[PDB]
Amino acid sequence: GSPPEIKPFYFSSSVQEGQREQVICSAITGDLPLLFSWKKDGLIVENFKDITLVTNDLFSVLVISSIKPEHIGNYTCNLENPFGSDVHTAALTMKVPELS
């Protein structure tokens, strides 16, 4: 089989508190099934109230339904299959917080 090559994902460059984010972790090559693991600054992401994961054997979407300052940081997707692994980290930066 072939090892996976991750497709980079990135957060928006103008994140505002209370808005939403979605990023897709996926591979351009690599035999299925793929397995996905998400961490935010080394923490289990999904246990954040406002973070939901949508995961199948092909891709995993990380959803932040309401951005809060606690979500600022680095999000790492680790991807593997029986033949290799890959990883990508994307930083979430907040441009505008709650003001009113």
Numbering used by the authors: -1 to 98
From the manuscript:
Recently, a shortened Dscam (sDscam) gene family with tandemly arrayed 5′ cassettes in Chelicerata species has been identified, which encodes ∼50–100 isoforms. Chelicerata sDscams could be classified into two subfamilies, sDscamα and sDscamβ, containing one and two variable Ig domains, respectively. Crystal structures and cell aggregation assays demonstrated that both α and β subfamilies of sDscam used Ig1 for the isoform-specific trans recognition in a hand-in-hand manner. Furthermore, the cis interactions were established by the three FNIII domains of sDscam, which assemble into a cross fold with a kink between FNIII2 and FNIII3.
To elucidate the molecular details of trans interactions of sDscam, we determined the crystal structures of Ig1 from Mesobuthus martensii sDscam isoforms α1, α7, and β6v2. We also determined the crystal structures of sDscam Ig1 from another chelicerate species Limulus polyphemus (isoforms α7 and β3v7) to provide insights into the conservation of sDscam trans recognition within Chelicerata. These crystal structures of Ig fragments were determined at 1.3–3.1 Å resolutions. The crystal structures of sDscam Ig1 from both M. martensii and L. polyphemus revealed a common assembly of antiparallel homodimer for both α and β subfamilies of sDscam. More interestingly, in some Ig1 crystal structures (M. martensii α1, α7, and L. polyphemus α7), the two protomers within a homodimer were related via a 2-fold symmetry axis, namely, these two protomers had identical conformations. This implied that the homophilic trans interactions of Ig1 were also symmetry-related. Similarly, sDscam Ig1 also employs the ABED face to form an antiparallel homodimer. However, among the seven Ig1 structures reported here, the complementary electrostatic potential surface pattern (negative in one end, neutral in the middle, and positive in the other end) has been only observed in the three β isoforms, but not in any one of the four α isoforms. Structural analysis showed that B and E strands constituted the core of ABED face and dominated the trans homophilic interactions of sDscam Ig1. The residue preceding the conserved B-strand cystine always interacts with its counterpart of the other protomer.
